[PDB]
Amino acid sequence: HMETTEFLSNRSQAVRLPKAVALPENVKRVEVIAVGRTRIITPAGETWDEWFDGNSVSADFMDNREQPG
Amino acid sequence: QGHMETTEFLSNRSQAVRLPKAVALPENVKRVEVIAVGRTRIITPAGETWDEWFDGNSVSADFMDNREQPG
Amino acid sequence: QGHMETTEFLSNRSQAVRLPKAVALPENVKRVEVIAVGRTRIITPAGETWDEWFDGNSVSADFMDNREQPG
Amino acid sequence: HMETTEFLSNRSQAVRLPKAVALPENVKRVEVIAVGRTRIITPAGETWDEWFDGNSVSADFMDNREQPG
Amino acid sequence: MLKFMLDTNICIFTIKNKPASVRERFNLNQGRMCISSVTLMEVIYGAEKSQMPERNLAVIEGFVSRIDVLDYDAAAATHTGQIRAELALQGRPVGPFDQMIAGHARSRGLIIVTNNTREFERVGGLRIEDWS
Amino acid sequence: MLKFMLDTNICIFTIKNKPASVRERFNLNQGRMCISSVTLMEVIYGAEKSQMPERNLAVIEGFVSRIDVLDYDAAAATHTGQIRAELALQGRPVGPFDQMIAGHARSRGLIIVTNNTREFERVGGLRIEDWS
Amino acid sequence: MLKFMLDTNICIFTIKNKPASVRERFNLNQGRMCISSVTLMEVIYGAEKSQMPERNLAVIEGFVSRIDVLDYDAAAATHTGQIRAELALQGRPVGPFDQMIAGHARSRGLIIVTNNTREFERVGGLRIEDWS
Amino acid sequence: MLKFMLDTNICIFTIKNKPASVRERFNLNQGRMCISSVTLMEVIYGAEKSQMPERNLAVIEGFVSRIDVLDYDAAAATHTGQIRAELALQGRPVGPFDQMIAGHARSRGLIIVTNNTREFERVGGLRIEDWS
């Protein structure tokens, strides 16, 4: 809920996760997903967990493919 | 693609994650805020809120308004 | 850019020039004709003449003509 | 005026200039220019010689820049 | 690494319903999952067709960030051409977009993942899975 | 560079009829001509559909050897989605394959060349020429 | 991805007036907004033209921090050339900078967003929206 | 390596007249020569404005293959912004396109090559050469 800064390390901008918002020690590797400006840091394997929670498509989202045939 | 795997390293007392060049942030961004959801962490460029700038500092009346485009 | 420098080597009795990956020909081209102008050599993909194909082999009448696009 | 074939050599498609259309031995290095399908093989330094000869722009080519100002 | 191609059907099925069964499945084969550009144009269409394009598209963008999008290549076009021609003789009808998705997979040798295997069963030489 | 995207309509029209007007247009704008991979699969299909596929395909391959084939990319897919959605609301009907070819053109800003102007004229933000 | 190209007209209009209608449009289509480098130099010029450049530039920088700046490329230049040539024959007059912004949009197929529709409406193959 | 930026003026001067003096000069500094995208849009315009676009453009394509084309970047835009603002106070008038070319050069520190140095002399901090 606070803020941090990135830093060029090992030729990568990387990040410094605060101890206040640090990940579980049981998480060795973490998938990083790029969407627009935001970057999603999801545990390895645990990638799709963010997308399924929330981010609800609108109720009028056309389920019909309307494929000609 | 868009997906990209990376490991983690504790430095400066803070556990840290490398950003591969695929997900590398724009170099313009100099500060970043971190949000907490489940075990996933969300990284948003700080101060990117459009509403912030609109109520933010406003520009002087000496703006030409006229584009003075050659013509 | 478009410009690109390369050296030369004689092989197979024929003096030969490497094509850097910038000027690398499309892999589809399998044969090439060489034209001679001054000291400059001109490399044109052989058989690329549009007029050749037009008078070339023509296609059977069993072509549907109808696109039979789904609709 | 005949024809030849390219060949993957040193990770390059390269070319085999026939002895019939070989370059002067005094030409050590040769600039290669890419325009469309055609590739121009001009002696080093002697690059622009092809473009100035022939390839005449049309007589009605607007010399005027017509820059607004 | 990439082994699975998600058809258009399963994508909307996930995008709309977000089923729990697919949750862990997607998580398991993360990095081994791809979608055809044909699939992309459909999901984009549904979003832009909807009354809240920006929202649905955002959900779609998130989906597309995890999976690799495959451009329709000449191999896919040629393969689909054959696939289409075969189906003509068989009499079996397959959807226009679905035809392209099938050929696209066969060209790159991917496994098709679909909730409705029925349509894809007509086309031969394809591996079809049901992740619903 | 590349300025024109050749529709499926005009391609078949040229392939079959071999029209003189088109040859000039072809020779004049040589090098500025491309086709979508979507365009390729249709003609590939048509060729294999005939009683002499190898004959028909052979002529077809020669055509594609001179033209550059443009892979249907995510940009093409997204633009096609919009076009489809736009046309959906307006009610104007455009063919599936044609929609994809149009989106490919708009994505890279190419000029569509087709004998059927009225159909593509429905699509917005697109430039259409008729070389027939 | 990116769908809208912000004209110089509307940018200054927003920068000065800070209109509420635009804010919604901005927040709604956040992330889909870009400006041409041509657009950047004008506002940079206008800022430095004022009696408080650093003040004005500071507000300007904040704006550009949220929007992605698109470099004027050869594709943009060529498309602008065509637009200029087209408009030349037709006689419709469009501003120099505006021409360049339009070509940038058409090259990447973006939607132009501008308060002055009539001027950009002269340009063909372009989609224009007015968010004012 | 790249050290010289050819303004629009000298390019057309060469493209139209093809002067012998420029022949050896161009040959000498081959590989150290570049042009701005602003310059490109102008030469494209002249070609497409002409009654034989395909021909003139072909000549242009050949020219562009030897020289490197530089995309207008934020640095050029910002630099031109300053350049434009300065000229306002000085009262000295410089052409719209020429202004952008000048800033583009200063941004990358290139040497301007022009047949008409007069206009560029107003702008400061630039190195101007006359290859005519």
Author numbering:
A (entry chain B), D (entry chain B): 0, 1G, 2 to 68
B (entry chain D), C (entry chain D): -2 to 68
E (entry chain A), F (entry chain C), G (entry chain C), H (entry chain A): 1 to 132
Verbatim from the authors:
To investigate the structural consequences of the vapB tolerance mutations, we used X-ray crystallography to determine structures of several VapB variants in complex with VapC. Moreover, the structures of VapBT3NC (2.6 Å), VapBT3N+A13P+L16RC (2.8 Å), and VapBV5EC (3.2 Å) revealed complexes that are virtually identical to the wild-type complex. This demonstrates that the overall architecture and integrity of the VapBC hetero-octamer are unaffected by the tolerance mutations. However, we noticed that the DNA-binding domain of VapB appears to be quite flexible and with low local resolution, which means that side chains are not visible in the regions containing the mutations. The hydrophobic residues Val5 and Leu16 both point towards the internal, hydrophobic core of the DNA-binding domain. As both residues are changed to polar/charged residues upon mutation (i.e., V5E and L16R), this could destabilize the fold of the domain affecting DNA interaction. Interestingly, plasmid loss assays show that all substitutions that cause antibiotic tolerance also reduce plasmid loss compared with VapBQ12C (all P < 0.0001). Plasmid loss assays demonstrate that reduced plasmid loss conferred by VapBT3N, VapBT3N+L7P, VapBV5E, VapBL7P, and VapBQ12L is Lon-dependent, similar to VapBL12 and VapBA12.
VapBC TA systems are the most common Type II TA system in bacteria, and consist of a VapB antitoxin and VapC PIN domain-containing toxin. The VapB antitoxin consists of two domains, an N-terminal promoter-binding domain and a C-terminal, intrinsically disordered region, which conceals and inhibits the active site of the VapC toxin in the VapBC complex. Like many Type II TA systems, vapBC expression is auto-regulated at the transcriptional level through direct binding of the higher-order TA complex to two operator sites (OS1 and OS2) in its promoter. The related vapBC locus on the chromosomally integrated Escherichia coli F plasmid is mutated in bacteria that are tolerant to beta-lactam antibiotics, before subsequently evolving resistance.
